[PDB]
Amino acid sequence: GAMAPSYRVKRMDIAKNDEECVVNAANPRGLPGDGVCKAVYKKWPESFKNSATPVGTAKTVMCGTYPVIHAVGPNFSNYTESEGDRELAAAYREVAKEVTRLGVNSVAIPLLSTGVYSGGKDRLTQSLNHLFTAMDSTDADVVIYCRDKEWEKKISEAIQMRT
Ligand SMILES: CNCc1cnn(-c2ccccc2)c1
Ligand SMILES: [Cl-]
Ligand SMILES: [Cl-]
Hints:
The PDB classes it as viral protein. The protein is an alpha/beta fold. It has helices spanning about 35-45, 80-100, 125-135, 150-160, and strands at about 5-10, 20-25, 60-65, 65-70, 105-110, 140-145. Helix 2 packs parallel to helix 3. The radius of gyration is 14 Å and the shape is globular. N-methyl-1-(1-phenyl-1H-pyrazol-4-yl)methanamine (W1Y) binds next to loops.
């Protein structure tokens, strides 16, 4: 565990993270995909051996000794708002189980289902609150990675508001 477990946010490529493991915003078939998933495939391609896993689950594959936690959020194009919300919450609970099992002191995590799986909706608050619900009982330092300048400010505000 971290001595004073924290949340932080950085605006940069999660493939350049400074944490002990990474969460991939994976597809269920273990395909290279787009966005975060394509960057993770380019940096840790060995971690896509038998990485396929259902929606709402996380599966860890080692790249050398570096753990890649493949977390499959729902594609809100295909799910109802209600069912998608349940699967998005479930994916983050499985990430917390993996982070705990691995014994890491830090984890790099993207906001699941906020990009090409968002169904064209802004899901920053929905995805972030499911992240907190899952990770708050863990003692790893959590570093959230984003792309958008306005998202960085909104994530930073949500973190600071609970300190
Ligand atoms: C990196 N993608 C996250 C993101 C940024 N912006 N939005 C967004 C904003 C308004 C309406 C729909 C979607 C999602
Ligand atoms: Cl970058
Ligand atoms: Cl996404």
